[PDB]
Amino acid sequence: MNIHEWQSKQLIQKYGGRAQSGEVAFSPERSRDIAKKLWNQFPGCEFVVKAQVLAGGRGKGHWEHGMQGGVKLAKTPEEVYEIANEMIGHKLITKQTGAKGINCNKVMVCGAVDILKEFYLSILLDRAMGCPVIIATSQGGMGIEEVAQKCPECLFKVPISVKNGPTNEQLVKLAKDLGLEGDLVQDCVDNVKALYQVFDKCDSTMVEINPLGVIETPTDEKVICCLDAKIAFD
Amino acid sequence: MNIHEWQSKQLIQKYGGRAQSGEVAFSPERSRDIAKKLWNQFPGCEFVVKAQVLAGGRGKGHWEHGMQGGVKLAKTPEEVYEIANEMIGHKLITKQTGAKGINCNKVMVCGAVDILKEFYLSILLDRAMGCPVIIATSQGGMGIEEVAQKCPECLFKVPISVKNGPTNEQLVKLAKDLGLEGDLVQDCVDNVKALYQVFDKCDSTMVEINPLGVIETPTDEKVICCLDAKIAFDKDAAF
Ligand SMILES: Nc1ncnc2c1ncn2[C@@H]1O[C@H](COP(=O)(O)OP(=O)(O)O)[C@@H](O)[C@H]1O
Ligand SMILES: Nc1ncnc2c1ncn2[C@@H]1O[C@H](COP(=O)(O)OP(=O)(O)O)[C@@H](O)[C@H]1O
Ligand SMILES: [Mg+2]
Ligand SMILES: [Mg+2]
Ligand SMILES: [N+]
Ligand SMILES: [N+]
Secondary structure, three states: EEOOOOHHHHHHHHOOOOOOEEEOOOOHHHHHHHHHOOOOOOOOOOOEEEOOOOOOOOOOOOOOOOOOEEEEEOOHHHHHHHHHHHHEEEEEEOOOOOOOOOEEOOEEEEEEOEEEEEEEEEEEEEEEOOOOEEEEEEOOOOOOHHHHHOOHHHEEEOOOOOOOOOHHHHHHHHHHHHOOHHHHHHHHHHHHHHHHHHHOOOOEEEEEEEEEEEEEEEEEEEEEOOOOOOOOOO | EEEEHHHHHHHHHHHOOOOOOOEOOOOHHHHHHHHHHHHOOOOOOOOOEOOOOOOOOOOOOOOOOOOOEEEEEOOOHHHHHHHHHHHHEEEEEEEOOOOOOOOOEOOEEOOOOOOOEEEEEEEEEEOOOEEEEEEEEEEEEEEHHHHHHHOOHEEEEEEEEOOOOOOOHHHHHHHHHHOOOOOHHHHHHHHHHHHHHHHHHOOOEEEEEEEEEEEOOOOEEEEEEEOOEEEEEEOOOOO
């Protein structure tokens, strides 16, 4: 059992992680209202509409009626209406779904942000090791399968003490191994700490953040932020 | 009679202008909640808390009990609570108010944005000329009075046909006179068109935008945006 993106992100926020939960809408009219209200706070901003379905590969998927993409850029609230209207009540087809696609009943409306770096981060129980493991790569753009066979220096695997959880030294090293400097190191530490707490305290089978991003705020500060989230349970 | 910033900005938006209306809160608890919810959309953004009072010079004002500023930057939702708690139910003292200040009953919570340029733009009925006039300077940071005597080249005054309203050629020239190029020229034209419609169709005696800004969106697009707004009306006007 997997939970939806927005639910996973809200759970991450509850444990102190930074994640763009946006706001969910169950109608295209409501989606447009969310975007219009957000223009009162950041005039001229763009939007991203994210189909909330239990499946990956949304961005490169397609809809029966012709729309391309399950994660779509929109420049206006009316474009948010148009995009959400093709998602809600319709089926999205991705490589992780059969040709049957999967039904979508709601979308996430997000502000469009500048993404500087994309990381992959997952937390799971590694049966071989017999302990929790934090897996991460500094090349979140490309799949994790390929990364381990086209640039293994960028993939990192961190065994975790089950009883003591991650140590500060482990997380600091992981942040620097991913290429982070300055304030971003401790920012990353805090976020991975929160991601592990979600994993441990929620009895999760997997916490996968793809991508864990370095984004710019509207005033150009660099911060760590979960831009996607998949949390699984048995 | 002047109306509050929140109302002026929403009125400008109704007529197609770009203005940061933010969201109004009547308690510090609500102010915090607005900021926290906004972090779901632009994580890590900063905030600006703006006292809604009928007086200018808020940014440079002070509160009796020690806080400095009526327009204040806040880095977190809890700082928004702290700042708003010192505004709501308290009196702000500015250059335009008396010594005792003026009561503040609500604040605007706004997202912090990068401001590239600040312009002054006003639309009013010039009695001497006997027609509406659009006044603007490319130096909105300094007072319009300072501009007229230390850089008059930056102040522009455009008489408007009362019957036909501003022409596209006047507005294009004004945008270029203010130093704009590229997409910002037409962006400025559209926004000033909207401001004049507010002035004309709402029977206003003054629409003052100080500053009319060039701001960056979160994805670094440059757009025109009203960052302050003062609209006046005359209850005892000539019929
Ligand atoms: N708010 C956003 N602004 C800009 N780009 C975004 C935003 N959120 C996500 N993206 C981009 O969209 C891509 C697809 O989104 P994602 O949530 O990962 O869905 P999926 O992995 O199912 O395709 C991300 O890899 C990221 O590059
Ligand atoms: N959202 C914002 N982000 C950053 N700075 C802002 C924002 N809105 C306004 N400002 C700045 O705050 C200053 C003071 O606010 P303003 O609305 O002009 O009030 P007042 O003129 O009464 O001081 C503005 O001139 C502008 O420089
Ligand atoms: Mg993803
Ligand atoms: Mg002002
Ligand atoms: N940015
Ligand atoms: N910016």
